[PDB]
Design a protein around this motif. Structure first.
Motif, PDB file in Angstrom:
ATOM      1  N   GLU A  71       0.782  -1.224   0.000  1.00  0.00           N
ATOM      2  CA  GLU A  71       0.000   0.000   0.000  1.00  0.00           C
ATOM      3  C   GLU A  71       0.822   1.286   0.000  1.00  0.00           C
ATOM      4  OE1 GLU A  71      -2.556  -0.196   3.386  1.00  0.00           O
ATOM      5  OE2 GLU A  71      -3.390  -2.137   2.843  1.00  0.00           O
TER       6      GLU A  71
ATOM      7  N   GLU B  37       2.666   4.661   1.859  1.00  0.00           N
ATOM      8  CA  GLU B  37       2.118   5.698   2.730  1.00  0.00           C
ATOM      9  C   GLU B  37       2.335   7.094   2.142  1.00  0.00           C
ATOM     10  OE1 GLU B  37       4.674   4.072   5.864  1.00  0.00           O
ATOM     11  OE2 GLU B  37       5.525   6.090   6.042  1.00  0.00           O
ATOM     12  N   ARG B  38       1.809   8.121   2.802  1.00  0.00           N
ATOM     13  CA  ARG B  38       1.981   9.481   2.304  1.00  0.00           C
ATOM     14  C   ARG B  38       3.248  10.085   2.878  1.00  0.00           C
ATOM     15  NH1 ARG B  38      -1.591  12.105  -0.118  1.00  0.00           N
ATOM     16  NH2 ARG B  38       0.390  12.793  -1.036  1.00  0.00           N
TER      17      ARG B  38
ATOM     18  N   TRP C 237      -0.807  12.560  -4.286  1.00  0.00           N
ATOM     19  CA  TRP C 237      -0.723  11.114  -4.160  1.00  0.00           C
ATOM     20  C   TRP C 237      -0.164  10.430  -5.408  1.00  0.00           C
ATOM     21  CZ3 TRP C 237      -3.008   7.575  -7.292  1.00  0.00           C
ATOM     22  CH2 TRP C 237      -4.088   7.994  -8.078  1.00  0.00           C
TER      23      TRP C 237
ATOM     24  N   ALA D 222       4.352   5.839  -2.321  1.00  0.00           N
ATOM     25  CA  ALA D 222       3.173   5.101  -2.764  1.00  0.00           C
ATOM     26  C   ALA D 222       3.602   3.657  -2.986  1.00  0.00           C
ATOM     27  CB  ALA D 222       2.641   5.682  -4.055  1.00  0.00           C
TER      28      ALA D 222
ATOM     29  N   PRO E  77      -1.819   1.660  -5.010  1.00  0.00           N
ATOM     30  CA  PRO E  77      -2.108   2.887  -5.753  1.00  0.00           C
ATOM     31  C   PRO E  77      -1.444   2.909  -7.136  1.00  0.00           C
ATOM     32  CG  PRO E  77      -0.495   3.290  -4.013  1.00  0.00           C
ATOM     33  CD  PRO E  77      -1.151   1.952  -3.732  1.00  0.00           C
TER      34      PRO E  77
ATOM     35  N   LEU F 239     -12.121  -5.068  -1.021  1.00  0.00           N
ATOM     36  CA  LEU F 239     -11.162  -5.241   0.054  1.00  0.00           C
ATOM     37  C   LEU F 239     -11.811  -6.159   1.066  1.00  0.00           C
ATOM     38  CD1 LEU F 239      -8.554  -4.658   1.333  1.00  0.00           C
ATOM     39  CD2 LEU F 239      -9.452  -2.490   2.227  1.00  0.00           C
TER      40      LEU F 239
ATOM     41  N   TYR G 164      -7.757   7.669  -5.188  1.00  0.00           N
ATOM     42  CA  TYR G 164      -7.369   8.081  -3.853  1.00  0.00           C
ATOM     43  C   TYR G 164      -8.517   8.035  -2.857  1.00  0.00           C
ATOM     44  CZ  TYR G 164      -4.629  10.278  -0.258  1.00  0.00           C
ATOM     45  OH  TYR G 164      -3.950  10.490   0.916  1.00  0.00           O
TER      46      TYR G 164
ATOM     47  N   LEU H 211      -9.390   4.564  -1.563  1.00  0.00           N
ATOM     48  CA  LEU H 211      -8.366   4.071  -0.644  1.00  0.00           C
ATOM     49  C   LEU H 211      -8.460   4.745   0.720  1.00  0.00           C
ATOM     50  CD1 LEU H 211      -5.275   3.862  -3.031  1.00  0.00           C
ATOM     51  CD2 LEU H 211      -7.025   2.153  -2.579  1.00  0.00           C
TER      52      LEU H 211
ATOM     53  N   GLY I 289     -11.010   3.143   2.780  1.00  0.00           N
ATOM     54  CA  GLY I 289     -10.548   1.863   3.288  1.00  0.00           C
ATOM     55  C   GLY I 289      -9.707   2.054   4.530  1.00  0.00           C
ATOM     56  N   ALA I 290      -8.747   2.974   4.450  1.00  0.00           N
ATOM     57  CA  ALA I 290      -7.862   3.269   5.572  1.00  0.00           C
ATOM     58  C   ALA I 290      -8.681   3.685   6.783  1.00  0.00           C
ATOM     59  CB  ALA I 290      -6.878   4.380   5.194  1.00  0.00           C
TER      60      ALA I 290
ATOM     61  N   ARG J 281     -10.419   0.826   8.365  1.00  0.00           N
ATOM     62  CA  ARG J 281      -9.453  -0.003   9.062  1.00  0.00           C
ATOM     63  C   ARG J 281      -9.223   0.534  10.471  1.00  0.00           C
ATOM     64  NH1 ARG J 281      -5.336  -1.178   4.826  1.00  0.00           N
ATOM     65  NH2 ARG J 281      -6.002  -3.044   3.672  1.00  0.00           N
TER      66      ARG J 281
ATOM     67  N   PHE K   7      -6.912  -7.279  -1.321  1.00  0.00           N
ATOM     68  CA  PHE K   7      -7.387  -6.160  -2.131  1.00  0.00           C
ATOM     69  C   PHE K   7      -7.423  -6.710  -3.542  1.00  0.00           C
ATOM     70  CE2 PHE K   7      -7.897  -1.524  -2.444  1.00  0.00           C
ATOM     71  CZ  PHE K   7      -7.939  -1.390  -3.827  1.00  0.00           C
TER      72      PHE K   7
HETATM   73  C1  EMQ Z   1       1.307  11.243   7.706  1.00  0.00           C
HETATM   74  N1  EMQ Z   1       2.147  10.099   7.380  1.00  0.00           N
HETATM   75  C2  EMQ Z   1       3.063   9.938   8.532  1.00  0.00           C
HETATM   76  C3  EMQ Z   1       1.279   8.890   7.331  1.00  0.00           C
HETATM   77  C4  EMQ Z   1       0.228   9.011   6.212  1.00  0.00           C
HETATM   78  N2  EMQ Z   1      -0.156   7.695   5.704  1.00  0.00           N
HETATM   79  C5  EMQ Z   1      -1.452   7.271   5.731  1.00  0.00           C
HETATM   80  O1  EMQ Z   1      -2.361   7.984   6.202  1.00  0.00           O
HETATM   81  N3  EMQ Z   1      -1.734   6.050   5.193  1.00  0.00           N
HETATM   82  C6  EMQ Z   1      -3.108   5.521   5.117  1.00  0.00           C
HETATM   83  C7  EMQ Z   1      -3.668   5.646   3.667  1.00  0.00           C
HETATM   84  C8  EMQ Z   1      -2.894   6.728   2.850  1.00  0.00           C
HETATM   85  C9  EMQ Z   1      -3.407   6.759   1.395  1.00  0.00           C
HETATM   86  C10 EMQ Z   1      -3.570   5.343   0.775  1.00  0.00           C
HETATM   87  C11 EMQ Z   1      -4.295   4.421   1.772  1.00  0.00           C
HETATM   88  O2  EMQ Z   1      -3.561   4.366   2.999  1.00  0.00           O
HETATM   89  C12 EMQ Z   1      -4.429   3.031   1.202  1.00  0.00           C
HETATM   90  C13 EMQ Z   1      -5.490   2.224   1.633  1.00  0.00           C
HETATM   91  C14 EMQ Z   1      -5.644   0.929   1.112  1.00  0.00           C
HETATM   92  C15 EMQ Z   1      -6.801   0.046   1.554  1.00  0.00           C
HETATM   93  F1  EMQ Z   1      -6.403  -1.298   1.498  1.00  0.00           F
HETATM   94  F2  EMQ Z   1      -7.210   0.371   2.850  1.00  0.00           F
HETATM   95  F3  EMQ Z   1      -7.878   0.243   0.681  1.00  0.00           F
HETATM   96  C16 EMQ Z   1      -4.722   0.448   0.157  1.00  0.00           C
HETATM   97  C17 EMQ Z   1      -3.659   1.247  -0.278  1.00  0.00           C
HETATM   98  C18 EMQ Z   1      -3.507   2.544   0.242  1.00  0.00           C
HETATM   99  N4  EMQ Z   1      -2.436   3.353  -0.208  1.00  0.00           N
HETATM  100  C19 EMQ Z   1      -2.214   4.717   0.357  1.00  0.00           C
HETATM  101  C20 EMQ Z   1      -1.535   5.597  -0.673  1.00  0.00           C
HETATM  102  C21 EMQ Z   1      -0.238   6.048  -0.411  1.00  0.00           C
HETATM  103  C22 EMQ Z   1       0.436   6.873  -1.333  1.00  0.00           C
HETATM  104  C23 EMQ Z   1      -0.189   7.256  -2.530  1.00  0.00           C
HETATM  105  C24 EMQ Z   1      -1.497   6.807  -2.804  1.00  0.00           C
HETATM  106  C25 EMQ Z   1      -2.179   5.977  -1.882  1.00  0.00           C
END
Ligand code: EMQ
Ligand code: ADP
Length: 331
Positions: free
Chosen positions: A101, A103-104, A112, A118, A122, A145, A196, A199, A202-203, A206, A224
């Motif tokens: 997955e 992170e940001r 994103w 990433a 994504p 998911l 985005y 996703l 989903g996060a 979770r 997924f």
């Molecule tokens: C602030 N820094 C410290 C932490 C931030 N990270 C964060 O919030 N992270 C959770 C979130 C952040 C955004 C997306 C999300 O997880 C996510 C959820 C799922 C799921 F399986 F749940 F569907 C699957 C893949 C992803 N990829 C992440 C993503 C990362 C980069 C580019 C595009 C997408």
């Protein structure tokens, strides 16, 4: 046939490790496709265990490196109308979620689409709308998911029902290697500029799951899945219909009560030892992914490890496990 492809990914030392000037017990050599582990002795003299895999990535590996060398080829097969699965296996904290997955990056540095942190999911969705929208392909994309915690099934993308709503699975009347998951929400993704959002939901879900279930992030298994329906219209005017499906599986932590994890191990052993009986039906995970284990799906496993001396036992366990899986034959 086509043996399961296995690659190892060692993560770097975290900020709370470098301050202690931690000594690594793990050495990676991509060209030799090997991973060497120090099992005792000194840095001036010592014994080590070595393993060869289909690919090996060290601490310096970036997300782009992983995607270009392992995912891109797999996604292409998916686009050709095939079924593919990628497993992430290893000890909690070694990089399963990071890899699958990502992170940001902190402080909102990039959008994103350009965030170098990433992961596979994504990047996959994004590229899909990039390589297909490029062609005059008539396509649709659906994602789901499905998560397993204590042998119960949850829908982590359904914005209508809360996570506490467990799902039911049954054997599929037709397909003998398939099952039916009642209630599993499939979300249509119209364009990358909608990826985005899906996703994020989903996060968020979770997080509620973490609240309700103990150590949810490390004990759950997540699947997924992305299905691509394509109506291709080649330059020759002929219209071919193709269906592609990819499963990105992030397994529960492997560190020394999890029926699905135990069963996956037993299924792998049965397959490698060519044992007549393969216990697929002994767990939800293995029943759901039966075709990815000795079936007709192209399968790859990304085993993640820590370079710290403190995780030696678990890192060796992970390597031995991954090593054995290489001997599995799919079709
Ligand atoms: C602030 N820094 C410290 C932490 C931030 N990270 C964060 O919030 N992270 C959770 C979130 C952040 C955004 C997306 C999300 O997880 C996510 C959820 C799922 C799921 F399986 F749940 F569907 C699957 C893949 C992803 N990829 C992440 C993503 C990362 C980069 C580019 C595009 C997408
Ligand atoms: N290759 C890597 N490079 C940098 N940080 C990583 C890497 N792999 C994991 N991490 C970091 O280490 C922590 C654990 O990773 P995570 O993917 O959540 O582990 P797991 O899902 O295996 O439990 C996170 O804080 C993550 O940012």
């Amino acid at each position: 046939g086509k043996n399961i492809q296995v690659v190892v990914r060692c993560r770097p030392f975290n900020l709370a490790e470098r301050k202690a000037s931690a000594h690594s017990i793990v050495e990676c050599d991509p060209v030799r496709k090997e991973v060497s582990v120090r099992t005792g002795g000194l840095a001036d003299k010592s014994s080590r265990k070595t393993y060869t895999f289909d690919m090996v990535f060290g601490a310096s590996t970036k997300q782009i490196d992983v995607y270009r060398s392992v995912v891109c080829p797999i996604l292409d097969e998916v686009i050709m109308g095939y079924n593919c699965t990628i497993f992430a296996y290893g000890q909690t904290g070694t990089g399963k979620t990071f890899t699958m997955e990502g992170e940001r990056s902190p402080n909102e540095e990039y959008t994103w689409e350009e965030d170098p942190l990433a992961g596979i999911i994504p990047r996959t969705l994004h590229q899909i709308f990039e390589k297909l929208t490029d062609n005059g392909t008539e396509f649709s994309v659906k994602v789901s998911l499905l998560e397993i915690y204590n042998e119960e099934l949850f829908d982590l993308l359904n914005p209508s029902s809360d996570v506490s709503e467990r799902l039911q699975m049954f054997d599929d009347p037709r397909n003998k290697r398939g099952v039916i998951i009642k209630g599993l929400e499939e979300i249509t993704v119209h364009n990358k500029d909608e990826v985005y959002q899906i996703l994020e939901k989903g996060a968020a879900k979770r997080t509620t799951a973490a609240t309700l279930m103990n150590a949810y992030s490390s004990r759950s298994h997540s699947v997924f899945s992305v299905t691509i329906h394509m109506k291709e219209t080649t330059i020759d005017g002929e219209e071919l219909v193709k269906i592609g499906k990819l499963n990105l599986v992030d397994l529960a932590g492997s560190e020394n009560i999890n029926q699905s994890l135990l069963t996956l191990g037993r299924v792998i052993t049965a397959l490698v030892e060519r044992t007549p009986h393969v216990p697929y039906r002994e767990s939800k995970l293995t029943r759901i992914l039966q075709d990815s284990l000795g079936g007709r799906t192209r399968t790859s496993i990304i085993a993640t490890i820590s370079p710290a001396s403190l995780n030696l036992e678990e890192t060796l366990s992970t390597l031995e496990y991954a090593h054995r899986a290489k001997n599995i034959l799919n079709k």
